[PDB]
């Protein structure tokens, strides 16, 4: 009559409250993130909020380069975010050593999702309060987005969004794909795809952006990289001339 909400055991209704409260934890950083697929690229966008003037902005980041090919964005407290990062980086390197090819995006998602399921079932391990969005241009499946949560769930996406205002981004993105009647962003260069992601982010949040408010990672053939404040600024000048 009390302790079924403290550890990961079933409640009379068939629920795991520790897992539910872990979802709540993912919204603690108050940051929204989204991901979109281009013709041959994949873009992650995340908000960057630096409340302190004493912080070094270049270290405040929730995007991680897991391998040469895989990139990951995280919603949730940073200690948990970096816990998941290091594990994923280790898991990717180990995969390469044992199997002789680079770990595909969707497999690393599965492996991380499986690891979460464990903290869901074992009592001494608490779930991590994070949602992990893996992106790459996989050599078999093309541009790819895969996302895992504290429940141990994971699935692929045409596009995705995560954060406090997640629902507004999602229905905005759906409405674009109904009109376009296809599941990707029809553009050759990744530059315009990044431009699309920001444009459709502002539109759904109703807040303008400067170079220090955002954070952009891009995945291409044989490379994943994160943009500098200056590359974002260049990209912001392009969208301003559009309207």
């Amino acid at each position: 009559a009390g302790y079924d909400r403290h550890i990961t055991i079933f409640s009379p209704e068939g629920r795991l409250y520790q897992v539910e409260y872990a979802f709540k934890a993912t919204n603690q950083t108050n940051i929204n993130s989204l991901a979109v697929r281009g013709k041959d690229c994949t873009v992650v966008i995340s908000q960057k909020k630096v409340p302190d003037k004493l912080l070094d902005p270049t270290t405040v980041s929730y995007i991680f380069c897991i391998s040469r090919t895989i990139g990951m964005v995280v919603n949730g407290p940073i200690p948990d975010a970096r816990n998941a990062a290091l594990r994923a980086k280790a898991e990717a390197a180990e995969f390469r050593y044992k199997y002789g090819y680079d770990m595909p995006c969707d497999v690393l998602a599965k492996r991380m999702a499986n690891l979460s399921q464990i903290y869901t079932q074992r009592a001494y391990m608490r779930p991590l309060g994070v949602i992990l969005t893996f992106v790459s241009v996989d050599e078999e499946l093309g541009p790819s987005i895969y996302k895992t949560d504290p429940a141990g769930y994971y699935v692929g996406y045409k596009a995705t969004a995560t954060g406090p205002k997640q629902q507004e981004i999602t229905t905005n993105l759906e409405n674009h794909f109904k009109k376009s009647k296809i599941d990707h962003i029809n553009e050759e260069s990744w530059e315009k795809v990044v431009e699309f992601a920001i444009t459709h982010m502002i539109d759904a949040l109703g807040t303008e952006f400067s170079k220090n408010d955002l954070e952009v990672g891009v995945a291409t053939k044989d490379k994943f990289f994160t943009l500098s404040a200056e590359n974002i600024e260049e990209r912001l000048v392009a969208i301003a001339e559009q309207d």
């Binding site: 079933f10 009379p12 209704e13 068939g14 009592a123 001494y124 895969y146 996406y157 596009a159 995705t160």
Partner: protein
């Protein structure tokens, strides 16, 4: 440092095992899935419940191949099912194929899956699995079979059954329509009719996952050369193959 070496599932004064009861409640909320056994095959089906319009439900397999002749589907907690599919596939090799040089018969693999679910019912520091499984298979000396596996680790053989959200109404629909002389093509027809009652939303090849355990597929083997290798009895129907059958419904 895990100090949880005691059971989390124990007996209450009434004799109930609380955690197993609660695991069954979780399965009850889960999406409806079913199984039907024909004279010349078995069919297992479920609904691909979309978590978002943006998600790609093709990447989410609710149906899984265990051995080339054995398949599985579920109701309840997806995560739990996924890791169970992984363990079951491995145990089929380590406890059977690596010893006897052939794939385990349906009853024994089921027995081994059940065994894994039992341990979570008793081992220190764990909760039961929040899934019920439906396993359809074929082995030379038993023919076609279908079993249900529960969170407690119990398994029963079924001629036809359904689990989850709308099991009660589905079981009643199956009793009316099942006979011991059903062909496979008929068993698929019934499966689609039963599932149409559970789905409120879109009912098509994209929102329904459906697999069979039937005849040997030589074109799906991948190689020719061994006469005593004729290929998998498990086949997942494509989005296109389901829609063809829905047009004559």
């Amino acid at each position: 440092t895990d100090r949880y070496s005691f059971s989390l599932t124990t007996f209450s004064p009434s004799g109930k095992l609380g955690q197993i009861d609660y695991a069954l409640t979780a399965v009850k909320q889960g999406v409806t899935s079913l199984g039907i056994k024909a004279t010349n095959g078995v069919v297992i089906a479920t609904e691909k419940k979309s978590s978002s319009p943006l998600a790609m439900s093709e990447t989410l397999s609710k149906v899984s191949l265990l051995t080339p002749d054995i398949g599985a589907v579920y109701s309840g907690m997806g995560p739990d099912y996924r890791v169970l599919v992984d363990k079951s596939r491995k145990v089929a090799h380590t406890s059977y194929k690596r010893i006897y040089g052939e794939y385990p018969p349906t009853k024994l693999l089921v027995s081994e899956v059940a065994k894994i679910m039992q341990e979570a019912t008793q081992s220190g520091g764990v909760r039961p699995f929040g899934v019920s499984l439906l396993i359809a298979g074929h082995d030379e000396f038993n023919g076609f079979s279908l079993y249900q596996v529960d969170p407690s680790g119990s398994y029963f053989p079924w001629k036809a059954t359904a689990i989850g959200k709308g099991s009660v109404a589905a079981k009643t629909f199956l009793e009316k329509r099942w006979n011991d002389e059903l062909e496979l093509e008929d068993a698929i027809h019934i499966a689609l009719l039963t599932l149409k009652e559970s789905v409120e939303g879109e009912f098509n090849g994209d929102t329904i996952e459906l697999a069979i355990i039937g005849d040997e597929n030589p074109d799906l083997l991948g190689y020719t050369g061994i006469p005593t290798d004729k290929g998998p009895r498990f086949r997942k129907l494509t989005s296109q193959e389901i829609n063809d059958r829905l047009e004559a419904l």
